[model samples]
Target: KPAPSAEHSYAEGEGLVKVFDNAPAEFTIFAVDTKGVARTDGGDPFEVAINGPDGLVVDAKVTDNNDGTYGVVYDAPVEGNYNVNVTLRGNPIKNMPIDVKCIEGANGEDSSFGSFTFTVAAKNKKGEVKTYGGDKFEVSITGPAEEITLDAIDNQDGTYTAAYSLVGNGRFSTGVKLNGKHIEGSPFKQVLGNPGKKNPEVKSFTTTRTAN
Candidate 1:
């Protein structure tokens, strides 16, 4: 219906997600027929592969859900970004490469926030681990009466980072924001000077920035 009302082809699933190292990340792709109706005969035509941050290509385990959905699974071993490419026969789908974030840290594990370098993962409204990136991230330091603003760099796999130098024994508040909103771990305190590389008790080491 290009001359009237064309049915825009869309990949009906999430385009991005966040997971841990060695954790199985799964996604889905739906199938439709020439008549524009979803199929259910397990006859979807698609190919899948996961591209890693190190220019690696891994074949994703594709499973037939038997309900018109193609299930893809890839347990990325590295701690970084991975791209999932789902194509039809040979042509790339509308949203060619899906995104995955293999975040750092283990289950039920927490890292210190005084380190100054942290990862910020996005989430759906009300904060859910359907964590993703590609949104605007802002970083600022209200340290020592000086306000500094910086941009968060996208890791390209659904995570972001913003780093700045910590100088002097300055005590001030730090700001981490996403799209102009204060996330759960948005505001944290920082007190300079360290001992044994572990700055014990810099107020609350709440790096709850993992919006998921």
Candidate 2:
């Protein structure tokens, strides 16, 4: 992900701060002075603490970029929600005590599209509910007749929906990926027959999120 541009205001808000936890996720800390300016002088060291669903987790790797920001790589050893606190010297930042959900990432599945509409879902390793948001989804159909490929639209509410025109009798391949990594059971297989609509066949995939 690209860092915020200089013209961007570094205020405190829910969307302004984020927890990566996606791949040993990076907890980015952006510090601002009272004058609403980025504190790049690097005054005090940042102190970070993580509290899991159970309690406190220790020994997270922290790095100071010598600018107004800090990076923390934590091993979220537990599932559910994690409360993270980031402080400068001893003072808490604007968006302290943020909640970080440390799920097992997500898994994909093959689902049927009614008519021209297709749907895909993501879940944790335990077959629990998770969303396919923040991932890349694509649908492609190719055969001796014709081939077409297009991106899927994320509903932003844990579901993705797309419409495609399957003209030829051939095979369709649909896949979902997060962070450039393909989830388990991706590239789902489907069949297209005749020039008319066919019932969709749905199959699920499963995987676990990493603790780190």
Candidate 3:
């Protein structure tokens, strides 16, 4: 009920300060009167500014929840702790710039885009390539009409092999992942040029026989 007016001059609240990359997130700002009672007046002075480490400003929206709270919503693409600069009127909140960390960034290693056969080296967190087959390594060549030529070949070592095919040429997003997660740096941006030609044969044939 609208019993009393809101103390828009003094407001406070918060929400998820850590979230997955490329996922949506939200926070709240509670509006209260001088007596510490929720002021559901809806129109409360507030702002949510999320600035990423990429030197870019995130797009955030603040709307009155009509329940004595203001919602701040946004999503992050790059991985980093974005300083969410929040404010009430012209006064900054206690935890004004909240550290919002976005993890599980999307990226991968570099490789030949048109390669027919590719290699993936799996290593532990310590950079040691232990015995293979214990992890779930996957190789994918996306953006093509022709299907893959063969499946991944287990080498028993840390390295893996896989054959792929292509139809036309364009830009493609290839990935090499382990355990359903994109290798350290996944979402590799590559080209879709003609499939690399497989070269292997004798240099020149020996002397031919006498008659045909």
Candidate 4:
């Protein structure tokens, strides 16, 4: 929000960096000029911005942390993809590309806390490659109709999948297998945010069986 100030030193053996979403959600950036040469002008001064599908813009500034790297924070109003641009001041740091990654959370805590992961592949069905990419699909599991919603991301193929755990004590999660087609006029979208813990009366887990 203010002109970037502060300074830091960076040396070799330090390049890969990570930023976690904490309480207020700050953007931590990492860059390198191993030769010890002052770079900030004409080099690509790292820049980051967020764009929403509705044309909303969130411009963040480069953070100065004394460590020859850049960091900033973006107070996002909602969840979506935000574009990032990183440069070495004015000149393009040759042979050196600034690495960037975006994460979501409260302050710096990861929003993906307690999330589990699994893989799903398209069945041997014909014409199934049309449902995968950098997009997300919201699917619903029919039941008490107030049950659950599965936020599925199309990974690579018809292998649509997602991983989530109960957020609070009474919280629950559920969804149905989307057959690459919308359940025409299904009220799946209407009953999404019902207030209550989900309890689907379908699944039966067998904890009695012993595993080796």
Residue 206 lDDT (model 4)? 13
lDDT of each: 0.60, 0.54, 0.60, 0.40
Q: Write the per-residue lDDT of candidate 1 for residues 1-212, one digit (tens) a residue.
A: 21111121235433246766746776777666556666655655678767887887776788888776777777677777887767776656656665767776465434323334767776767767444466777766664422233345766666778765443344657788777787786687767644334334333222223222
Residues 65-117, model 3: lDDT tens digits: 88777777787777777777666665565445567677864434433345477
TM-score of each: 0.43, 0.41, 0.43, 0.29
Q: Whole-model lDDT, candidate 1?
A: 0.60
Off by over 4 Å in 2: 1-22, 107-212
The C-alpha RMSD of each candidate to the native structure, in angstroms, is: 18.0, 19.3, 14.4, 16.1
Give residue 160's lDDT in candidate 2 (0 to 100): 61
Model 2 over residues 120-170: C-alpha lDDT tens digits? Answer: 665656886565465555444333334343446666756666555544454
What C-alpha lDDT, on a 0 to 100 scale, does residue 38 get in candidate 4?
Answer: 49
Tens digits of per-residue lDDT for model 4, 28-145 = 5545434444434222255554453346575665556765455666544544444433333433333323342335446533343454444455444474545644433444433343
Scored against the true structure, residue 207 in model 4 reaches a CA lDDT of 12
- As for candidate 2, its clashing pairs are 21-25, 24-212, 104-209
Candidate 2 at residue 170, lDDT? 45
lDDT score of residue 138 within candidate 1:
70
